[PDB]
Amino acid sequence: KKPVNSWTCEDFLAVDESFQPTAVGFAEALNNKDKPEDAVLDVQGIATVTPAIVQACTQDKQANFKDKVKGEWDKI
């Protein structure tokens, strides 16, 4: 019931493992965007950065999830 842009790293860590790439891609589409028609879905990128984000969120449980996504994503 919490909008994704208000999740903390704790909220994300409570999402079942199988749907953690989905939360990351959701947050990416939502935020990190140009124009909807140009938005590309980089399945290798999401697959690669999700574990990084799970680790980052574990060490920083009250940070904003979407900001961690944007951050991790930039630093590869």
Site of interaction with its own copies (CB under 8 A): 1-6, 15-16, 19, 21-23, 25-31, 33, 36-41, 43, 46-47
CB of 58 to its own copies, least distance (A): 20
* Residue nearer to its own copies on the CB measure, 36 or 75: 36
Select from 75, 73, 76 the least CA-distant residue to 21: 73
Buried b (16+ CB within 10 A) or exposed e, 17-31: eeebbebbbebbeee
CB of 8 to its own copies, least distance (A): 14
* Residue nearer to its own copies on the CB measure, 44 or 62: 44
Select from 30, 33, 27 the least CA-distant residue to 11: 27
What whole-number distance in Å separates Cα of residue 9 and Cα of residue 69? 10
CB of 15 to its own copies, least distance (A): 7
